[PDB]
Design a protein around this ligand. Structure first.
Ligand SMILES: *C(=N)c1ncc(C(=O)NCc2ccccc2)cn1
Lengths: 11, 204
C-alpha cells in the first residue's frame, strides 16, 4: 500500500 | 477520458462501500458531519464548472477521529496547491467542528504515489482505497488485503526507470481487483481500460 503521514489538527 | 462520476458511484457501490459513501463531489465538498458513523467521499480537485481534473478520496473514522486523504500521487499540500489549486483546510475544519466534541482530528494522508505520471486511473485507485477503508477503517492505507496488492513509491521518483515495473504492476492489479469485485467494471472492462490507461496522457 502507501506510506502516510499523521498530523494532529485542533480547531 | 478518465472516469466519470457515474462510473465511480457504480463501482463504489459494487465494492460494498454504499453504507458509508456520501458520493462524488467537486472541490467544494463541505467535510464530514458524522460524529458517530464511518463515512467517505470521492472529491475532485476542481470545481464542477470545469468538468473534473483529478480525483482524491477522503474518509472518516468517528471512533479514532481520523480523516484520511488518499490522493493517488501522494503530493504534498504545497504540490496539491501548485499543481491543482486545491486546498482542503476548510473541509478539515468543518469536519473537526461537526464530528468531534473536542474539535480535534488526526489527518492521515498518503505520502507516496501509486499512479504513473501519464495514467488516467486516479478515480479507479480511489475506489480501491475506499474498499480498503470500508473493510479496514483503522489501517486503510497499507497492511490490509486490498492495499497490499499495490505498492507506493516516492513521488520524486516517478520518471525513473527503477520504479516503472512497480507502477505498471499497480495499475494491472487495480484492474484485476475491479474485475474480481465489480460487476459494473466487468461489463464495461474494455471501455474503462481504454479511458484510464497507463499512458493515456502521454505527450506526443
Ligand atoms: C486521473 N488520473 C485523472 N482524472 C481525470 C483526467 C482528465 O484528463 N481530466 C480532464 C481535464 C480537464 C482540464 C484539465 C486537465 C484535465 C486525467 N486523469
Amino acid at each position: 500500500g502507501v506510506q502516510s503521514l499523521k498530523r494532529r489538527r485542533c480547531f | 477520458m478518465g472516469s466519470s462520476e457515474q462510473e465511480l458511484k457504480a463501482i463504489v457501490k459494487d465494492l460494498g462501500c454504499g453504507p458509508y459513501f456520501l458520493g462524488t463531489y467537486d472541490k467544494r465538498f463541505p467535510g464530514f458531519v458524522s460524529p458517530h458513523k464511518l463515512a467517505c467521499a470521492i472529491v475532485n480537485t476542481a470545481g464542477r464548472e470545469t468538468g473534473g481534473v483529478h480525483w482524491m478520496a477522503f474518509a472518516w473514522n468517528p471512533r479514532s477521529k481520523t480523516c484520511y486523504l488518499f490522493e493517488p500521487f501522494g503530493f504534498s499540500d504545497q504540490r496539491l496547491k501548485q499543481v491543482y489549486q486545491f486546498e482542503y483546510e476548510s473541509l478539515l475544519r468543518r469536519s473537526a467542528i461537526a464530528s468531534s466534541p473536542d474539535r480535534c482530528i488526526t489527518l492521515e494522508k498518503s505520502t507516496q504515489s501509486v499512479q504513473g505520471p501519464n495514467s488516467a486511473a486516479c478515480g479507479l485507485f480511489c475506489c480501491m482505497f475506499l474498499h480498503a477503508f470500508a473493510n479496514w477503517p483503522q489501517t486503510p492505507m497499507d497492511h490490509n488485503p486490498t492495499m497490499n496488492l499495490i505498492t507506493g513509491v516516492p513521488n520524486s521518483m516517478l520518471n525513473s526507470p527503477q520504479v516503472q515495473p512497480t507502477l505498471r504492476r499497480n495499475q494491472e492489479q487495480l484492474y484485476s481487483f475491479l474485475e474480481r469485485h465489480s460487476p459494473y467494471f466487468r461489463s464495461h472492462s474494455a471501455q474503462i481500460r481504454s479511458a484510464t490507461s497507463f499512458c493515456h496522457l502521454k505527450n506526443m
